PDB file of all heavy atoms in Angstrom:
ATOM      1  N   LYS A   1       0.828  -1.207   0.000  1.00 52.23           N
ATOM      2  CA  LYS A   1       0.000   0.000   0.000  1.00 52.23           C
ATOM      3  C   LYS A   1       0.866   1.263   0.000  1.00 52.23           C
ATOM      4  O   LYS A   1       0.894   2.040   0.952  1.00 52.23           O
ATOM      5  CB  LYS A   1      -0.974   0.009   1.185  1.00 52.23           C
ATOM      6  CG  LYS A   1      -1.985  -1.109   1.185  1.00 52.23           C
ATOM      7  CD  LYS A   1      -2.996  -0.912   0.081  1.00 52.23           C
ATOM      8  CE  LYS A   1      -4.081  -1.966   0.139  1.00 52.23           C
ATOM      9  NZ  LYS A   1      -4.936  -1.774   1.337  1.00 52.23           N
ATOM     10  N   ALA A   2       1.601   1.430  -1.093  1.00 49.97           N
ATOM     11  CA  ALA A   2       2.472   2.588  -1.200  1.00 49.97           C
ATOM     12  C   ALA A   2       1.728   3.858  -1.579  1.00 49.97           C
ATOM     13  O   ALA A   2       2.313   4.941  -1.485  1.00 49.97           O
ATOM     14  CB  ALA A   2       3.580   2.324  -2.218  1.00 49.97           C
ATOM     15  N   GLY A   3       0.466   3.750  -1.997  1.00 52.05           N
ATOM     16  CA  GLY A   3      -0.290   4.934  -2.367  1.00 52.05           C
ATOM     17  C   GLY A   3      -0.593   5.838  -1.191  1.00 52.05           C
ATOM     18  O   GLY A   3      -0.743   7.050  -1.357  1.00 52.05           O
ATOM     19  N   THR A   4      -0.670   5.271   0.012  1.00 53.57           N
ATOM     20  CA  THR A   4      -0.847   6.092   1.199  1.00 53.57           C
ATOM     21  C   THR A   4       0.415   6.855   1.553  1.00 53.57           C
ATOM     22  O   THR A   4       0.335   7.878   2.239  1.00 53.57           O
ATOM     23  CB  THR A   4      -1.258   5.229   2.391  1.00 53.57           C
ATOM     24  OG1 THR A   4      -0.194   4.330   2.723  1.00 53.57           O
ATOM     25  CG2 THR A   4      -2.497   4.424   2.058  1.00 53.57           C
ATOM     26  N   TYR A   5       1.565   6.385   1.104  1.00 51.90           N
ATOM     27  CA  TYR A   5       2.825   6.969   1.530  1.00 51.90           C
ATOM     28  C   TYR A   5       3.038   8.305   0.836  1.00 51.90           C
ATOM     29  O   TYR A   5       2.871   8.396  -0.384  1.00 51.90           O
ATOM     30  CB  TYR A   5       3.972   6.015   1.223  1.00 51.90           C
ATOM     31  CG  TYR A   5       3.979   4.771   2.082  1.00 51.90           C
ATOM     32  CD1 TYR A   5       4.587   3.608   1.641  1.00 51.90           C
ATOM     33  CD2 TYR A   5       3.341   4.746   3.314  1.00 51.90           C
ATOM     34  CE1 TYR A   5       4.591   2.462   2.412  1.00 51.90           C
ATOM     35  CE2 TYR A   5       3.335   3.603   4.093  1.00 51.90           C
ATOM     36  CZ  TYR A   5       3.962   2.467   3.637  1.00 51.90           C
ATOM     37  OH  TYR A   5       3.957   1.330   4.407  1.00 51.90           O
ATOM     38  N   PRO A   6       3.358   9.360   1.571  1.00 50.99           N
ATOM     39  CA  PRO A   6       3.615  10.657   0.939  1.00 50.99           C
ATOM     40  C   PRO A   6       4.902  10.673   0.135  1.00 50.99           C
ATOM     41  O   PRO A   6       4.932  11.120  -1.014  1.00 50.99           O
ATOM     42  CB  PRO A   6       3.704  11.613   2.134  1.00 50.99           C
ATOM     43  CG  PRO A   6       2.985  10.919   3.231  1.00 50.99           C
ATOM     44  CD  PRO A   6       3.271   9.471   3.032  1.00 50.99           C
ATOM     45  N   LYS A   7       5.968  10.169   0.741  1.00 50.14           N
ATOM     46  CA  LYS A   7       7.311  10.266   0.199  1.00 50.14           C
ATOM     47  C   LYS A   7       7.867   8.868  -0.017  1.00 50.14           C
ATOM     48  O   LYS A   7       7.710   7.991   0.835  1.00 50.14           O
ATOM     49  CB  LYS A   7       8.205  11.058   1.151  1.00 50.14           C
ATOM     50  CG  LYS A   7       9.582  11.358   0.636  1.00 50.14           C
ATOM     51  CD  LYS A   7      10.312  12.252   1.614  1.00 50.14           C
ATOM     52  CE  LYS A   7      11.740  12.498   1.172  1.00 50.14           C
ATOM     53  NZ  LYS A   7      11.790  13.287  -0.088  1.00 50.14           N
ATOM     54  N   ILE A   8       8.478   8.646  -1.176  1.00 50.74           N
ATOM     55  CA  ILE A   8       9.060   7.360  -1.534  1.00 50.74           C
ATOM     56  C   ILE A   8      10.433   7.627  -2.130  1.00 50.74           C
ATOM     57  O   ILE A   8      10.580   8.519  -2.969  1.00 50.74           O
ATOM     58  CB  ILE A   8       8.171   6.590  -2.531  1.00 50.74           C
ATOM     59  CG1 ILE A   8       6.843   6.194  -1.897  1.00 50.74           C
ATOM     60  CG2 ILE A   8       8.843   5.335  -3.017  1.00 50.74           C
ATOM     61  CD1 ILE A   8       5.853   5.649  -2.886  1.00 50.74           C
ATOM     62  N   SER A   9      11.442   6.887  -1.687  1.00 51.14           N
ATOM     63  CA  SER A   9      12.776   7.032  -2.243  1.00 51.14           C
ATOM     64  C   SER A   9      13.337   5.663  -2.579  1.00 51.14           C
ATOM     65  O   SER A   9      13.154   4.706  -1.823  1.00 51.14           O
ATOM     66  CB  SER A   9      13.713   7.737  -1.278  1.00 51.14           C
ATOM     67  OG  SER A   9      13.986   6.900  -0.176  1.00 51.14           O
ATOM     68  N   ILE A  10      14.026   5.580  -3.711  1.00 53.05           N
ATOM     69  CA  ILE A  10      14.683   4.365  -4.163  1.00 53.05           C
ATOM     70  C   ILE A  10      16.179   4.572  -4.021  1.00 53.05           C
ATOM     71  O   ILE A  10      16.709   5.592  -4.472  1.00 53.05           O
ATOM     72  CB  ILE A  10      14.326   4.053  -5.623  1.00 53.05           C
ATOM     73  CG1 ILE A  10      12.821   3.965  -5.800  1.00 53.05           C
ATOM     74  CG2 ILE A  10      14.966   2.765  -6.050  1.00 53.05           C
ATOM     75  CD1 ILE A  10      12.198   2.872  -5.018  1.00 53.05           C
ATOM     76  N   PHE A  11      16.863   3.627  -3.392  1.00 51.66           N
ATOM     77  CA  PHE A  11      18.316   3.668  -3.323  1.00 51.66           C
ATOM     78  C   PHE A  11      18.897   2.665  -4.297  1.00 51.66           C
ATOM     79  O   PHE A  11      18.646   1.463  -4.186  1.00 51.66           O
ATOM     80  CB  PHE A  11      18.823   3.377  -1.917  1.00 51.66           C
ATOM     81  CG  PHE A  11      18.643   4.507  -0.970  1.00 51.66           C
ATOM     82  CD1 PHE A  11      18.776   4.302   0.383  1.00 51.66           C
ATOM     83  CD2 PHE A  11      18.359   5.776  -1.425  1.00 51.66           C
ATOM     84  CE1 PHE A  11      18.617   5.331   1.269  1.00 51.66           C
ATOM     85  CE2 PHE A  11      18.193   6.804  -0.540  1.00 51.66           C
ATOM     86  CZ  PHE A  11      18.327   6.588   0.805  1.00 51.66           C
ATOM     87  N   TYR A  12      19.679   3.159  -5.241  1.00 51.93           N
ATOM     88  CA  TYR A  12      20.302   2.283  -6.213  1.00 51.93           C
ATOM     89  C   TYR A  12      21.799   2.528  -6.172  1.00 51.93           C
ATOM     90  O   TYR A  12      22.284   3.405  -5.454  1.00 51.93           O
ATOM     91  CB  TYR A  12      19.706   2.496  -7.608  1.00 51.93           C
ATOM     92  CG  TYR A  12      20.017   3.832  -8.223  1.00 51.93           C
ATOM     93  CD1 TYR A  12      21.062   3.976  -9.122  1.00 51.93           C
ATOM     94  CD2 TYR A  12      19.243   4.941  -7.942  1.00 51.93           C
ATOM     95  CE1 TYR A  12      21.348   5.192  -9.694  1.00 51.93           C
ATOM     96  CE2 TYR A  12      19.525   6.165  -8.508  1.00 51.93           C
ATOM     97  CZ  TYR A  12      20.578   6.281  -9.386  1.00 51.93           C
ATOM     98  OH  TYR A  12      20.870   7.492  -9.962  1.00 51.93           O
ATOM     99  N   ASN A  13      22.538   1.740  -6.941  1.00 50.09           N
ATOM    100  CA  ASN A  13      23.987   1.845  -7.000  1.00 50.09           C
ATOM    101  C   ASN A  13      24.370   2.372  -8.370  1.00 50.09           C
ATOM    102  O   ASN A  13      24.035   1.762  -9.387  1.00 50.09           O
ATOM    103  CB  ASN A  13      24.635   0.500  -6.724  1.00 50.09           C
ATOM    104  CG  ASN A  13      24.430   0.065  -5.311  1.00 50.09           C
ATOM    105  OD1 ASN A  13      24.562   0.861  -4.387  1.00 50.09           O
ATOM    106  ND2 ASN A  13      24.074  -1.194  -5.126  1.00 50.09           N
ATOM    107  N   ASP A  14      25.050   3.505  -8.391  1.00 49.42           N
ATOM    108  CA  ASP A  14      25.258   4.240  -9.629  1.00 49.42           C
ATOM    109  C   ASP A  14      26.701   4.087 -10.060  1.00 49.42           C
ATOM    110  O   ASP A  14      27.595   4.652  -9.415  1.00 49.42           O
ATOM    111  CB  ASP A  14      24.916   5.718  -9.440  1.00 49.42           C
ATOM    112  CG  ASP A  14      24.779   6.463 -10.754  1.00 49.42           C
ATOM    113  OD1 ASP A  14      24.945   5.844 -11.822  1.00 49.42           O
ATOM    114  OD2 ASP A  14      24.497   7.678 -10.718  1.00 49.42           O
ATOM    115  N   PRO A  15      26.979   3.360 -11.118  1.00 49.85           N
ATOM    116  CA  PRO A  15      28.347   3.325 -11.632  1.00 49.85           C
ATOM    117  C   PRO A  15      28.681   4.607 -12.376  1.00 49.85           C
ATOM    118  O   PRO A  15      28.257   4.822 -13.516  1.00 49.85           O
ATOM    119  CB  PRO A  15      28.344   2.098 -12.547  1.00 49.85           C
ATOM    120  CG  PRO A  15      26.936   1.963 -12.982  1.00 49.85           C
ATOM    121  CD  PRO A  15      26.075   2.481 -11.871  1.00 49.85           C
ATOM    122  N   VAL A  16      29.442   5.476 -11.713  1.00 50.41           N
ATOM    123  CA  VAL A  16      29.857   6.729 -12.330  1.00 50.41           C
ATOM    124  C   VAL A  16      30.832   6.450 -13.465  1.00 50.41           C
ATOM    125  O   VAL A  16      30.686   6.965 -14.579  1.00 50.41           O
ATOM    126  CB  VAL A  16      30.462   7.660 -11.266  1.00 50.41           C
ATOM    127  CG1 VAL A  16      30.961   8.945 -11.893  1.00 50.41           C
ATOM    128  CG2 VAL A  16      29.440   7.940 -10.179  1.00 50.41           C
ATOM    129  N   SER A  17      31.827   5.612 -13.201  1.00 44.40           N
ATOM    130  CA  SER A  17      32.676   5.055 -14.244  1.00 44.40           C
ATOM    131  C   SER A  17      32.911   3.585 -13.946  1.00 44.40           C
ATOM    132  O   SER A  17      32.195   2.994 -13.134  1.00 44.40           O
ATOM    133  CB  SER A  17      34.001   5.799 -14.345  1.00 44.40           C
ATOM    134  OG  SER A  17      34.819   5.200 -15.332  1.00 44.40           O
ATOM    135  N   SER A  18      33.903   2.984 -14.597  1.00 41.64           N
ATOM    136  CA  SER A  18      34.148   1.562 -14.389  1.00 41.64           C
ATOM    137  C   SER A  18      34.769   1.282 -13.027  1.00 41.64           C
ATOM    138  O   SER A  18      34.386   0.313 -12.361  1.00 41.64           O
ATOM    139  CB  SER A  18      35.034   1.018 -15.508  1.00 41.64           C
ATOM    140  OG  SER A  18      36.320   1.608 -15.474  1.00 41.64           O
ATOM    141  N   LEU A  19      35.708   2.114 -12.587  1.00 39.95           N
ATOM    142  CA  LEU A  19      36.377   1.905 -11.311  1.00 39.95           C
ATOM    143  C   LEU A  19      35.785   2.754 -10.200  1.00 39.95           C
ATOM    144  O   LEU A  19      36.294   2.728  -9.077  1.00 39.95           O
ATOM    145  CB  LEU A  19      37.872   2.185 -11.440  1.00 39.95           C
ATOM    146  CG  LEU A  19      38.619   1.223 -12.361  1.00 39.95           C
ATOM    147  CD1 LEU A  19      40.085   1.606 -12.480  1.00 39.95           C
ATOM    148  CD2 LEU A  19      38.469  -0.208 -11.878  1.00 39.95           C
ATOM    149  N   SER A  20      34.721   3.497 -10.483  1.00 38.22           N
ATOM    150  CA  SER A  20      34.031   4.292  -9.482  1.00 38.22           C
ATOM    151  C   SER A  20      32.589   3.820  -9.364  1.00 38.22           C
ATOM    152  O   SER A  20      32.051   3.161 -10.254  1.00 38.22           O
ATOM    153  CB  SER A  20      34.070   5.782  -9.830  1.00 38.22           C
ATOM    154  OG  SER A  20      33.353   6.037 -11.022  1.00 38.22           O
ATOM    155  N   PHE A  21      31.968   4.161  -8.246  1.00 39.72           N
ATOM    156  CA  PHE A  21      30.588   3.772  -8.001  1.00 39.72           C
ATOM    157  C   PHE A  21      29.954   4.853  -7.140  1.00 39.72           C
ATOM    158  O   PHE A  21      30.617   5.810  -6.734  1.00 39.72           O
ATOM    159  CB  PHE A  21      30.515   2.392  -7.343  1.00 39.72           C
ATOM    160  CG  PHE A  21      31.032   2.365  -5.942  1.00 39.72           C
ATOM    161  CD1 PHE A  21      30.168   2.466  -4.860  1.00 39.72           C
ATOM    162  CD2 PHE A  21      32.381   2.207  -5.699  1.00 39.72           C
ATOM    163  CE1 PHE A  21      30.645   2.441  -3.569  1.00 39.72           C
ATOM    164  CE2 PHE A  21      32.868   2.182  -4.405  1.00 39.72           C
ATOM    165  CZ  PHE A  21      31.997   2.297  -3.339  1.00 39.72           C
ATOM    166  N   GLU A  22      28.666   4.670  -6.829  1.00 37.63           N
ATOM    167  CA  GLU A  22      27.927   5.659  -6.061  1.00 37.63           C
ATOM    168  C   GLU A  22      26.648   5.041  -5.530  1.00 37.63           C
ATOM    169  O   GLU A  22      25.931   4.393  -6.301  1.00 37.63           O
ATOM    170  CB  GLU A  22      27.583   6.874  -6.930  1.00 37.63           C
ATOM    171  CG  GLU A  22      26.950   8.012  -6.180  1.00 37.63           C
ATOM    172  CD  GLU A  22      27.925   8.694  -5.250  1.00 37.63           C
ATOM    173  OE1 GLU A  22      29.138   8.688  -5.546  1.00 37.63           O
ATOM    174  OE2 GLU A  22      27.483   9.231  -4.217  1.00 37.63           O
ATOM    175  N   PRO A  23      26.338   5.185  -4.240  1.00 36.44           N
ATOM    176  CA  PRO A  23      24.959   4.973  -3.781  1.00 36.44           C
ATOM    177  C   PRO A  23      24.157   6.241  -4.028  1.00 36.44           C
ATOM    178  O   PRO A  23      24.650   7.349  -3.813  1.00 36.44           O
ATOM    179  CB  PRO A  23      25.123   4.683  -2.286  1.00 36.44           C
ATOM    180  CG  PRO A  23      26.366   5.370  -1.914  1.00 36.44           C
ATOM    181  CD  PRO A  23      27.275   5.312  -3.115  1.00 36.44           C
ATOM    182  N   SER A  24      22.933   6.085  -4.508  1.00 32.13           N
ATOM    183  CA  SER A  24      22.167   7.235  -4.948  1.00 32.13           C
ATOM    184  C   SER A  24      20.710   7.113  -4.547  1.00 32.13           C
ATOM    185  O   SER A  24      20.129   6.020  -4.536  1.00 32.13           O
ATOM    186  CB  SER A  24      22.260   7.413  -6.450  1.00 32.13           C
ATOM    187  OG  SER A  24      23.594   7.700  -6.816  1.00 32.13           O
ATOM    188  N   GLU A  25      20.138   8.270  -4.236  1.00 30.67           N
ATOM    189  CA  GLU A  25      18.737   8.440  -3.897  1.00 30.67           C
ATOM    190  C   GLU A  25      17.972   8.890  -5.129  1.00 30.67           C
ATOM    191  O   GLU A  25      18.441   9.742  -5.885  1.00 30.67           O
ATOM    192  CB  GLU A  25      18.587   9.476  -2.783  1.00 30.67           C
ATOM    193  CG  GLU A  25      17.164   9.705  -2.305  1.00 30.67           C
ATOM    194  CD  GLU A  25      17.105  10.578  -1.070  1.00 30.67           C
ATOM    195  OE1 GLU A  25      18.180  10.998  -0.595  1.00 30.67           O
ATOM    196  OE2 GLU A  25      15.989  10.841  -0.573  1.00 30.67           O
ATOM    197  N   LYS A  26      16.806   8.319  -5.327  1.00 30.51           N
ATOM    198  CA  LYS A  26      15.980   8.718  -6.448  1.00 30.51           C
ATOM    199  C   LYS A  26      14.542   8.774  -5.962  1.00 30.51           C
ATOM    200  O   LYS A  26      13.961   7.733  -5.636  1.00 30.51           O
ATOM    201  CB  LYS A  26      16.143   7.736  -7.603  1.00 30.51           C
ATOM    202  CG  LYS A  26      15.394   8.134  -8.838  1.00 30.51           C
ATOM    203  CD  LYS A  26      16.022   9.348  -9.491  1.00 30.51           C
ATOM    204  CE  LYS A  26      15.315   9.714 -10.789  1.00 30.51           C
ATOM    205  NZ  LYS A  26      13.933  10.235 -10.556  1.00 30.51           N
ATOM    206  N   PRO A  27      13.945   9.955  -5.855  1.00 34.72           N
ATOM    207  CA  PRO A  27      12.609  10.054  -5.268  1.00 34.72           C
ATOM    208  C   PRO A  27      11.523   9.665  -6.259  1.00 34.72           C
ATOM    209  O   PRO A  27      11.691   9.732  -7.475  1.00 34.72           O
ATOM    210  CB  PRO A  27      12.504  11.532  -4.893  1.00 34.72           C
ATOM    211  CG  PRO A  27      13.379  12.213  -5.870  1.00 34.72           C
ATOM    212  CD  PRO A  27      14.519  11.277  -6.144  1.00 34.72           C
ATOM    213  N   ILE A  28      10.394   9.245  -5.699  1.00 35.32           N
ATOM    214  CA  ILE A  28       9.218   8.831  -6.442  1.00 35.32           C
ATOM    215  C   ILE A  28       8.077   9.721  -5.998  1.00 35.32           C
ATOM    216  O   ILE A  28       7.595   9.600  -4.866  1.00 35.32           O
ATOM    217  CB  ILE A  28       8.861   7.365  -6.194  1.00 35.32           C
ATOM    218  CG1 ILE A  28      10.039   6.477  -6.536  1.00 35.32           C
ATOM    219  CG2 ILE A  28       7.653   6.978  -7.010  1.00 35.32           C
ATOM    220  CD1 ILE A  28      10.474   6.648  -7.929  1.00 35.32           C
ATOM    221  N   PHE A  29       7.628  10.604  -6.875  1.00 31.59           N
ATOM    222  CA  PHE A  29       6.554  11.506  -6.502  1.00 31.59           C
ATOM    223  C   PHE A  29       5.221  10.784  -6.612  1.00 31.59           C
ATOM    224  O   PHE A  29       4.934  10.157  -7.634  1.00 31.59           O
ATOM    225  CB  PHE A  29       6.580  12.737  -7.391  1.00 31.59           C
ATOM    226  CG  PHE A  29       7.859  13.496  -7.308  1.00 31.59           C
ATOM    227  CD1 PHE A  29       8.743  13.496  -8.369  1.00 31.59           C
ATOM    228  CD2 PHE A  29       8.172  14.224  -6.173  1.00 31.59           C
ATOM    229  CE1 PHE A  29       9.923  14.206  -8.299  1.00 31.59           C
ATOM    230  CE2 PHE A  29       9.352  14.933  -6.092  1.00 31.59           C
ATOM    231  CZ  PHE A  29      10.229  14.925  -7.158  1.00 31.59           C
ATOM    232  N   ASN A  30       4.414  10.855  -5.560  1.00 30.27           N
ATOM    233  CA  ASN A  30       3.125  10.188  -5.619  1.00 30.27           C
ATOM    234  C   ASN A  30       2.108  11.031  -6.389  1.00 30.27           C
ATOM    235  O   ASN A  30       2.327  12.211  -6.677  1.00 30.27           O
ATOM    236  CB  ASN A  30       2.621   9.837  -4.223  1.00 30.27           C
ATOM    237  CG  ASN A  30       2.609  11.018  -3.295  1.00 30.27           C
ATOM    238  OD1 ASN A  30       3.014  12.110  -3.657  1.00 30.27           O
ATOM    239  ND2 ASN A  30       2.121  10.807  -2.084  1.00 30.27           N
ATOM    240  N   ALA A  31       0.979  10.392  -6.723  1.00 32.01           N
ATOM    241  CA  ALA A  31       0.036  10.964  -7.673  1.00 32.01           C
ATOM    242  C   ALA A  31      -0.668  12.187  -7.115  1.00 32.01           C
ATOM    243  O   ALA A  31      -1.031  13.087  -7.879  1.00 32.01           O
ATOM    244  CB  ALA A  31      -0.997   9.920  -8.099  1.00 32.01           C
ATOM    245  N   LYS A  32      -0.851  12.240  -5.796  1.00 33.88           N
ATOM    246  CA  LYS A  32      -1.433  13.411  -5.152  1.00 33.88           C
ATOM    247  C   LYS A  32      -0.534  14.630  -5.299  1.00 33.88           C
ATOM    248  O   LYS A  32      -1.031  15.757  -5.394  1.00 33.88           O
ATOM    249  CB  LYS A  32      -1.702  13.084  -3.681  1.00 33.88           C
ATOM    250  CG  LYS A  32      -2.335  14.187  -2.846  1.00 33.88           C
ATOM    251  CD  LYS A  32      -1.322  14.902  -1.951  1.00 33.88           C
ATOM    252  CE  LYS A  32      -0.853  14.005  -0.813  1.00 33.88           C
ATOM    253  NZ  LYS A  32       0.103  14.701   0.094  1.00 33.88           N
ATOM    254  N   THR A  33       0.782  14.418  -5.345  1.00 32.91           N
ATOM    255  CA  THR A  33       1.720  15.530  -5.450  1.00 32.91           C
ATOM    256  C   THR A  33       1.664  16.179  -6.825  1.00 32.91           C
ATOM    257  O   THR A  33       1.881  17.391  -6.952  1.00 32.91           O
ATOM    258  CB  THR A  33       3.129  15.024  -5.141  1.00 32.91           C
ATOM    259  OG1 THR A  33       3.114  14.374  -3.869  1.00 32.91           O
ATOM    260  CG2 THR A  33       4.133  16.151  -5.071  1.00 32.91           C
ATOM    261  N   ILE A  34       1.310  15.401  -7.849  1.00 34.68           N
ATOM    262  CA  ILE A  34       1.430  15.862  -9.227  1.00 34.68           C
ATOM    263  C   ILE A  34       0.431  16.977  -9.533  1.00 34.68           C
ATOM    264  O   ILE A  34       0.741  17.901 -10.294  1.00 34.68           O
ATOM    265  CB  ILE A  34       1.267  14.660 -10.168  1.00 34.68           C
ATOM    266  CG1 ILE A  34       2.254  13.574  -9.776  1.00 34.68           C
ATOM    267  CG2 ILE A  34       1.576  15.044 -11.592  1.00 34.68           C
ATOM    268  CD1 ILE A  34       2.054  12.293 -10.530  1.00 34.68           C
ATOM    269  N   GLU A  35      -0.749  16.950  -8.920  1.00 36.94           N
ATOM    270  CA  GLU A  35      -1.661  18.073  -9.085  1.00 36.94           C
ATOM    271  C   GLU A  35      -1.235  19.283  -8.274  1.00 36.94           C
ATOM    272  O   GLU A  35      -1.623  20.405  -8.607  1.00 36.94           O
ATOM    273  CB  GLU A  35      -3.082  17.691  -8.684  1.00 36.94           C
ATOM    274  CG  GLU A  35      -3.671  16.566  -9.491  1.00 36.94           C
ATOM    275  CD  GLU A  35      -3.411  15.236  -8.844  1.00 36.94           C
ATOM    276  OE1 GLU A  35      -2.868  15.237  -7.720  1.00 36.94           O
ATOM    277  OE2 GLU A  35      -3.749  14.199  -9.444  1.00 36.94           O
ATOM    278  N   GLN A  36      -0.449  19.083  -7.226  1.00 36.51           N
ATOM    279  CA  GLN A  36       0.088  20.181  -6.439  1.00 36.51           C
ATOM    280  C   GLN A  36       1.338  20.771  -7.054  1.00 36.51           C
ATOM    281  O   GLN A  36       1.980  21.619  -6.429  1.00 36.51           O
ATOM    282  CB  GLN A  36       0.385  19.696  -5.021  1.00 36.51           C
ATOM    283  CG  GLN A  36      -0.855  19.243  -4.270  1.00 36.51           C
ATOM    284  CD  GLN A  36      -0.544  18.667  -2.904  1.00 36.51           C
ATOM    285  OE1 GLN A  36       0.617  18.543  -2.511  1.00 36.51           O
ATOM    286  NE2 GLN A  36      -1.589  18.301  -2.173  1.00 36.51           N
ATOM    287  N   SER A  37       1.694  20.336  -8.245  1.00 33.06           N
ATOM    288  CA  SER A  37       2.899  20.821  -8.878  1.00 33.06           C
ATOM    289  C   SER A  37       2.639  22.210  -9.432  1.00 33.06           C
ATOM    290  O   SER A  37       1.601  22.429 -10.066  1.00 33.06           O
ATOM    291  CB  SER A  37       3.314  19.877  -9.991  1.00 33.06           C
ATOM    292  OG  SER A  37       3.450  18.562  -9.487  1.00 33.06           O
ATOM    293  N   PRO A  38       3.525  23.176  -9.183  1.00 33.33           N
ATOM    294  CA  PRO A  38       3.332  24.519  -9.748  1.00 33.33           C
ATOM    295  C   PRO A  38       3.377  24.514 -11.257  1.00 33.33           C
ATOM    296  O   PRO A  38       2.563  25.166 -11.918  1.00 33.33           O
ATOM    297  CB  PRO A  38       4.501  25.313  -9.152  1.00 33.33           C
ATOM    298  CG  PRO A  38       4.924  24.532  -7.950  1.00 33.33           C
ATOM    299  CD  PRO A  38       4.705  23.105  -8.312  1.00 33.33           C
ATOM    300  N   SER A  39       4.308  23.756 -11.819  1.00 33.04           N
ATOM    301  CA  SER A  39       4.244  23.397 -13.225  1.00 33.04           C
ATOM    302  C   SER A  39       3.459  22.096 -13.303  1.00 33.04           C
ATOM    303  O   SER A  39       4.012  20.999 -13.354  1.00 33.04           O
ATOM    304  CB  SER A  39       5.639  23.254 -13.816  1.00 33.04           C
ATOM    305  OG  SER A  39       6.350  24.475 -13.757  1.00 33.04           O
ATOM    306  N   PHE A  40       2.157  22.218 -13.242  1.00 32.10           N
ATOM    307  CA  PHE A  40       1.388  21.066 -13.687  1.00 32.10           C
ATOM    308  C   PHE A  40       0.351  21.428 -14.723  1.00 32.10           C
ATOM    309  O   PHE A  40       0.151  20.676 -15.679  1.00 32.10           O
ATOM    310  CB  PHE A  40       0.690  20.350 -12.540  1.00 32.10           C
ATOM    311  CG  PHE A  40      -0.146  19.197 -12.999  1.00 32.10           C
ATOM    312  CD1 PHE A  40       0.456  18.076 -13.534  1.00 32.10           C
ATOM    313  CD2 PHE A  40      -1.523  19.235 -12.911  1.00 32.10           C
ATOM    314  CE1 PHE A  40      -0.297  17.019 -13.975  1.00 32.10           C
ATOM    315  CE2 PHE A  40      -2.280  18.171 -13.340  1.00 32.10           C
ATOM    316  CZ  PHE A  40      -1.661  17.061 -13.870  1.00 32.10           C
ATOM    317  N   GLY A  41      -0.295  22.574 -14.577  1.00 33.02           N
ATOM    318  CA  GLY A  41      -1.389  22.878 -15.458  1.00 33.02           C
ATOM    319  C   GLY A  41      -0.987  23.286 -16.854  1.00 33.02           C
ATOM    320  O   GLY A  41      -1.877  23.470 -17.691  1.00 33.02           O
ATOM    321  N   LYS A  42       0.313  23.467 -17.117  1.00 33.48           N
ATOM    322  CA  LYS A  42       0.770  23.651 -18.490  1.00 33.48           C
ATOM    323  C   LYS A  42       0.385  22.460 -19.345  1.00 33.48           C
ATOM    324  O   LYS A  42      -0.123  22.616 -20.458  1.00 33.48           O
ATOM    325  CB  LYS A  42       2.283  23.819 -18.552  1.00 33.48           C
ATOM    326  CG  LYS A  42       2.868  25.057 -17.935  1.00 33.48           C
ATOM    327  CD  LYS A  42       4.352  25.091 -18.280  1.00 33.48           C
ATOM    328  CE  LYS A  42       5.050  26.307 -17.719  1.00 33.48           C
ATOM    329  NZ  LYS A  42       5.139  26.234 -16.240  1.00 33.48           N
TER     330      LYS A  42
END
């Protein structure tokens, strides 16, 4: 039941190059937020 959740973040592993790496945050905007977007009605 992730639809109730306001904020969602995915942590993935980002290969910046071959010998480098990165843990990274990637947010997931829920559907209620999208109508609250200042750039939405365009």
